Enzyme design. Structure first.
Site, mmCIF file in Angstrom:
data_model
loop_
_atom_site.group_PDB
_atom_site.id
_atom_site.type_symbol
_atom_site.label_atom_id
_atom_site.label_comp_id
_atom_site.label_asym_id
_atom_site.label_seq_id
_atom_site.Cartn_x
_atom_site.Cartn_y
_atom_site.Cartn_z
ATOM 1 N N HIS A 159 -7.041 3.929 -8.539
ATOM 2 C CA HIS A 159 -7.740 3.255 -7.463
ATOM 3 C C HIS A 159 -7.166 3.563 -6.095
ATOM 4 C CE1 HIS A 159 -4.459 0.454 -8.409
ATOM 5 N NE2 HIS A 159 -4.674 -0.172 -7.265
ATOM 6 N N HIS A 195 -3.382 4.664 -5.753
ATOM 7 C CA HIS A 195 -2.428 4.113 -6.701
ATOM 8 C C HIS A 195 -2.921 4.429 -8.104
ATOM 9 C CE1 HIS A 195 -1.234 1.078 -3.352
ATOM 10 N NE2 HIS A 195 -0.639 2.249 -3.207
ATOM 11 N N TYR A 237 0.840 -1.191 0.000
ATOM 12 C CA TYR A 237 0.000 0.000 0.000
ATOM 13 C C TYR A 237 0.877 1.243 0.000
ATOM 14 C CZ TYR A 237 -3.702 -3.282 1.381
ATOM 15 O OH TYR A 237 -4.567 -4.347 1.423
ATOM 16 N N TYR A 238 2.083 1.112 0.543
ATOM 17 C CA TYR A 238 3.021 2.223 0.583
ATOM 18 C C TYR A 238 3.928 2.240 -0.640
ATOM 19 C CZ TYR A 238 1.955 3.710 5.355
ATOM 20 O OH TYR A 238 1.350 4.203 6.486
ATOM 21 N N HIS A 273 -6.963 2.089 -1.984
ATOM 22 C CA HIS A 273 -7.113 0.999 -1.047
ATOM 23 C C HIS A 273 -7.520 1.666 0.264
ATOM 24 C CE1 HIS A 273 -5.406 -2.056 -3.608
ATOM 25 N NE2 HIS A 273 -4.416 -1.234 -3.913
HETATM 26 CU CU LIG Z 1 -3.183 -0.733 -5.710
#
Ligand SMILES: [Cu+2]
Length: 293
Positions: free
Chosen positions: A161, A150, A18-19, A163
């Site tokens: 998108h 992202h 996620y990072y 998260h």
């Molecule tokens: Cu993603």
DNA sequence: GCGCACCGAAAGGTGCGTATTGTCT
């Protein structure tokens, strides 16, 4: 599109990706890719960019301010849940308009659509509480959420998108932090996806875009046809090839077959040059005859 | 859950199952 996934210990590693800027251009402090959200987050004194350290701690179940580790009541023969992942993915054309043609306003449109939907998911945040052996469900209304934006798919296509990682925690009226009872949010996935869709569409129309709604109830900007969308939808084509090779009918496939085609059709995850990638996107767009006007 | 069986210790808590669109971890 809205997909959810309950996160257990074996997925705590995925909480690292996620990072690893799935995003790129706008990840560079441009509106900054990560952001905390929720009354619960505010309760813990958290706003702005998400801290990798603090986030890792909350994933583990540690508030830190003089509290004990959470979820210790988890049966050892069960999986410790660290959160609930709600992934919001914009329509392809939308991703194109924002990432290829470059339109930061689309990015903001998407972020608002996402934030308003999470406010609704939050209203469904619940916790349990027992008194003398009698259990009760309590709508707490508070969530601690780490949002990560992202911009690319596994095939390096434009794919806007976010998260929304809802942490497995909530504060009850009595002031106690407990695991989240996710029934309501999980069973409201389809509904929350429509809220996202609606909020996104509203935001896009305020910028002046015309939307073309399809059978599904989904939409794409009007100035971009199907063929053009498919040209930037490689993962979709890979999935369709898998079904074809299996002689399967996409109009009726078991969950096992569907997940098998999604996971097994994935190629090797290689890095890219964000600078060069965008130039590729642009070149491809022209070839497809796309007019970002 | 469609209430249970475990966890830890608080006549307490938690997982479990839930979910099923497409642009497709
Ligand atoms: Cu993603």
């Amino acid at each position: 599109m809205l997909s959810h996934m309950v996160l257990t210990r074996q997925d705590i590693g995925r909480a690292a990706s996620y990072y690893e800027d799935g995003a790129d251009d706008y990840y560079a402090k441009d509106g900054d890719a990560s952001e905390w959200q929720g009354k619960g987050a505010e309760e813990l004194g958290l706003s702005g960019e998400v801290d990798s350290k603090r986030f890792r701690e909350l994933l583990a179940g540690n508030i830190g301010e003089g509290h004990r580790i959470m979820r210790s009541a988890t049966r050892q023969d069960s999986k410790e849940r660290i959160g609930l992942d709600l992934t919001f993915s914009a329509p392809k054309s939308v991703s194109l308009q924002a990432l290829v043609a470059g339109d930061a306003e689309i990015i903001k449109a998407h972020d608002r659509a996402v934030a308003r939907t999470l406010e609704q998911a939050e209203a469904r945040a619940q916790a349990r509480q027992k008194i003398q052996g009698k259990t009760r469900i309590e709508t707490t209304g508070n969530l601690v959420i780490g949002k990560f934006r992202h911009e690319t798919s596994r095939e390096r296509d434009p794919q806007l998108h976010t998260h929304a990682v809802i942490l497995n925690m909530t504060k009850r009226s009595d002031g106690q932090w407990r695991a989240l009872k996710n029934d309501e949010i999980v069973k409201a996935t389809r509904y929350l996806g429509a809220v996202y869709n609606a909020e996104l569409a509203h935001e896009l129309q305020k910028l002046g875009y015309q939307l073309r709604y399809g059978k599904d109830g989904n939409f794409d900007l009007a100035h971009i046809d199907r063929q053009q969308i498919e040209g930037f939808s490689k993962r979709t084509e890979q999935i369709a090839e898998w079904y074809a090779a299996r002689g399967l009918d996409p109009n009726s496939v078991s969950l096992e077959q569907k997940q098998a085609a999604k996971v097994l059709s994935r190629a090797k995850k290689t890095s890219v040059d964000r600078e060069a990638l965008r130039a590729e996107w642009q070149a491809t767009a022209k070839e497809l005859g796309i007019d970002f006007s």
